[PDB]
Amino acid sequence: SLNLVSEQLLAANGLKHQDLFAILGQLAERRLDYGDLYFQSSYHESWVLEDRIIKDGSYNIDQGVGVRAISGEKTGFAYADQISLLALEQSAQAARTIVRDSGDGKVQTLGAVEHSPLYTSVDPLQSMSREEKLDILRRVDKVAREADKRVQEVTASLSGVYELILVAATDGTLAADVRPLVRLSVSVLVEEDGKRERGASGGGGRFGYEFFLADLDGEVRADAWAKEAVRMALVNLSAVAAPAGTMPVVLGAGWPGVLLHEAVGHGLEGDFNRRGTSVFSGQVGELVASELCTVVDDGTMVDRRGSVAIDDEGTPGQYNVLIENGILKGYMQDKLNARLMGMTPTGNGRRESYAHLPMPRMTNTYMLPGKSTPQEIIESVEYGIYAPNFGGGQVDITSDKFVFSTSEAYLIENGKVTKPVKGATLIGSGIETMQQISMVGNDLKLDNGVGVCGKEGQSLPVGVGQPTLKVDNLTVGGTA
Amino acid sequence: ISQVEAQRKILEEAVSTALELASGKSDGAEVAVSKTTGISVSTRYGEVENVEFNSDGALGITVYHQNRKGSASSTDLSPQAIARTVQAALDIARYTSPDPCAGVADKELLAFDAPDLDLFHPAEVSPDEAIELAARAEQAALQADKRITNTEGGSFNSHYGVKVFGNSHGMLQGYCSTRHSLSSCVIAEENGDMERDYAYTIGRAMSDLQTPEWVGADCARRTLSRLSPRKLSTMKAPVIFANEVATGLFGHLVGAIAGGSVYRKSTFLLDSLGKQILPDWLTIEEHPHLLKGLASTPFDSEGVRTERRDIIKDGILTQWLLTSYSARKLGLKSTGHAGGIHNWRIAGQGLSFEQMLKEMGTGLVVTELMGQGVSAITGDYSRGAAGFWVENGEIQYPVSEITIAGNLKDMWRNIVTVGNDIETRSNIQCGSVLLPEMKIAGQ
Ligand code: NA
Ligand code: NA
Ligand SMILES: [Zn+2]
């Protein structure tokens, strides 16, 4: 990857290795712990089907360089939407003004090392023909409409990104990545006797569009997802008022792992903990979850949306155990916060683009499976909720309050799943909720490739996952 | 002033170049460009933390041929990059399907001679000057009370922008704007419970901002008020949406009356045009041409003129919020809402916040909401809340880890009053709002 990316980002823009030396040298005129240059080019395409036709398409291009100068707690940062020597010089000269004092100028020699490949370098935009891409959307439309007569509207979209990145730093880091990302989304509207509801499905990952035509449990994946959006819509159409108050909640496997993303994930990002602003600050070695819970953030999963072959600081993705048998083991880091905490980078230094600062961020966050069957978990509840699907969530990491909102949910009555109920926001304290996890299923899965995480205005692709699990007490925001 | 006039010339030329390149190969085209420049700084314990120099540029084009559309964008505005962008959009439009509602906005609706709304009030603020404002705000918060034990810092932002829009009916208009803001956010602790809150000031001119010391005082006040909350028991009670969240309560209306939602039948207000959906005394005024307004605009994102309208008049829904495409789907004309709404104003009904507490007597004041939890198609509402419990017309204690639930149709229709404590830093500006009952889920 490095030679191929270097040819596209550096050589093609009149830059050599020695220009990297010169610019890093300009930063190192000042008293800095670290400086870096981050180069990026990306290409985004989208296609949208609605009203049985190919309604829209887009093609979006960006490129640029971002330059950081860091001293202790401090960062100076400037960037440009072009890759050139002048853009690098102007950005370095602005960023380094963070400190006036002279430095010793002693940078480490630039030197790349190998990392495990986690996804193809084949451009997904060019690897499939335009009509074959549009046939995916046409097939989703046909299947969804054929699934039930009550289907009145279908919106199906395909998105693809191809991104090249290169990072060079004063600590000697020299690293590159080639990042594909595709997503298929489906939304359907159903109507019956004047009542309307919506349902959605989709997913993707770091590969080409052929994934959407591959097999999923004996059917074509795009077809299965088309049928899932309809099924979801019809459940919602039948749903009755959700109960209100504190009760047992059984969460399904996969995307309900939003629980972990909100309840512990953000709270374990090293920036909050270095500052002391997270409820988890200073709690390494303490019981922060039930003894049944092992939570990992894993940047190493081949082909997954949330994975990072390198992070945006050039650190290869890692399997990081955050909580082990309920005990807090550590935090997700970037280079800045790791230095200030006396810790090491973990492969969690991520930025939305060259025009944004990296910070500690999640990759794929999930709970390891346990011994219970999903059926045993459901049978243990006399009255509660079963929630196999969610929309999003949110967390206050200081007060340790989080929310997440159901997208498919049911009553459990006498150990059996019964009536579908309307969307409800669930709320709890993160630590207290994790300590209430009394059963952990043997059925781990991750989401289909749909996660978007927002922190400080920067949106990133992430994964979540878990087996089926039981939270003994959780507050359900129903009306009934 | 000269940097921005240099940019404005370049941007106008980029629009004209893109339109000319498109004109021979398309029946219509729309081009939008922008450039935003400025600084963003932060402080930690009164010392500089981050200094970020911002410079963002953008060109987007949409072309139409045989009622087929295609779009492309680039942050590179070189002639060769513009040519590639135009070609990319034209190539897409060869493969999309004909859609008769798609196209350049109607010529008769375009702001060919757009009004000057006085949005541009530049300041030469140096990074060191910016750091001092942020530090002053943060320090004022930190020194307020000994329970303030940590910080998320002070922040100052100052930016100027230029936007130009043109299309194939011959519109080419642009305008400049500025925005400055100052904030701080601190953490307080009591008996092992931490809470965080923030305060801010925002305006188009620096001389419209509150002082740093005001921001810090407000930050500390808000943060300390959060300490030692209770989790309420599950109940039905009246609810006041404090001004800062009441604006968002009316904000849910935007999605519900958007033309895109209406023509797709994906809104719970589909059959409500001309019906009384709010109290008969409540009017929502839209004021797109307010001088210096935070959401004032001389034209929408399709170049369509923006107009003074009463969206709700005496409780009655008077119109949808339409764009060119959704208007055409409904057999109507655009109302100038491409890119959203442009300053909503809802007058108070005479009561202060204190008087609203007394009127309510016993109930919940919500000051912060969390999560999504609002169904566009049904109006069902379920959000996480923090705020205060009120009894005897007096705040008793903060509350958190609760939800509030209902349905927007009922919530809006049965509003009791709206206060004179108007939130003035937002697009939608109103006071606090009293609802007679919601379901509070807790213990
Ligand atoms: Na490896
Ligand atoms: Na033409
Ligand atoms: Zn997140």
Numbering used by the authors:
A (entry chain A): 2 to 481
B (entry chain B): 8 to 450
Show me the paper's own sentences about this structure.
TldD/E cleaves the N-terminal leader sequence from the modified MccB17 precursor peptide, to yield mature antibiotic, while it has no effect on the unmodified peptide. Both proteins are essential for the activity; however, only the TldD subunit forms a novel metal-containing active site within the hollow core of the heterodimer.
To explore the substrate binding site of the TldD/E heterodimer, wild-type or mutant (Glu263Ala) TldD/E was co-crystallized with a variety of peptides and peptide mimics, leading to four distinct ligand-bound complexes. Wild-type TldD/E crystals were grown in the presence of the peptide angiotensin II, and customized angiotensin II variant where the central (Tyr-Ile) peptide bond is replaced with a non-cleavable methylene bond, to yield two co-crystal structures with clear density for peptides where the carboxyl group of the C-terminal residue acts as a ligand to the catalytic zinc ion.
